[PDB]
Design a protein around this ligand. Structure first.
Ligand SMILES: OC[C@H]1O[C@@H](O[C@H]2[C@H](O)[C@@H](O)[C@H](O)O[C@@H]2CO)[C@H](O)[C@@H](O)[C@H]1O
Lengths: 148, 148
């Protein structure tokens, strides 16, 4: 399982893309997108995500460092194609190991849906897609944000 | 949401029945049943349940005081009629208020299934059943345990 802590999160199909909250904006319904790294070595606070775990399970919340918005599915509408956005309230996610070491799926608990990135263009929105075991557009890797 | 802590858990249709781990047995796959209170004022450790919450959500685990077994759906088989059992691996549950003051449903997240007690017969097993708006055999209330 991924240990609790603060991370950058990169896509496996598109290795030059991080999970990013548009414009560092705290408003409801601000889009979550794929984007190039925006500061060396670990980004500004809109590309750093704090993971909190329910012990002895694979269930987590995800919250940005600055501003302090959670990851949520828009309008709590748990269907194929729905948008990911920033909000004052989270959607709980299940972070599940895949076939290769160090690759994870970010899944909706108990439903056949997962976070996916459909293109390499900068600022493409992240959306839900059907589970597909080997599709690298819905697999992700974690890099720690290390402080002193 | 219900405050974290240690509780007895009584059915709303059948107020003489507590959630109980059969025989205080530590084995994997031991049945969870409805049963009369087994000690004054708050039972032994097989009738006392500790609730741990994921912050800013309604998702919890449930663990008995002695032996220290979690609540699990048998073989992780999330369908109508499946058995509830004791195990070292928990199933995450969503605990949601029902309005009359102090009453709740104990649901499987994102599915229309909930813990149900089918009869008042002593030692009847607890199973999954479908959610509705009116039946009292899928509603539960809580008594705090005073450790001292
Ligand atoms: O059978 C449910 C009931 O078991 C009690 O424990 C019994 C056990 O079943 C029996 O095999 C034995 O030899 O004596 C034990 C003590 O009477 C539990 O105490 C009760 O809470 C239920 O779980």
């Amino acid at each position: 399982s991924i240990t609790p802590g603060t991370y950058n999160i990169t896509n496996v199909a598109y290795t030059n893309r991080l999970i990013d909250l548009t414009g560092s904006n705290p408003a409801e319904n601000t889009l979550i997108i794929g984007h190039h790294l925006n500061k060396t070595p670990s980004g500004y606070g809109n590309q750093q995500w704090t993971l909190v775990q329910l012990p002895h399970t694979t269930i987590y919340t995800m919250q940005a460092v600055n501003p302090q918005s959670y990851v949520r599915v828009r309008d709590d509408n748990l269907v194929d194609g729905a948008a990911l956005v920033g909000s004052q309230q989270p959607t709980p996610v299940s972070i599940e190991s895949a076939g290769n070491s160090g690759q994870f799926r970010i899944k909706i608990p108990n439903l056949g849906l997962a976070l996916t990135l459909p293109s390499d263009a900068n600022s493409t929105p992240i959306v839900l897609g059907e589970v597909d075991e080997t599709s690298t557009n819905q697999l992700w890797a974690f890099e720690s944000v290390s402080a002193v």
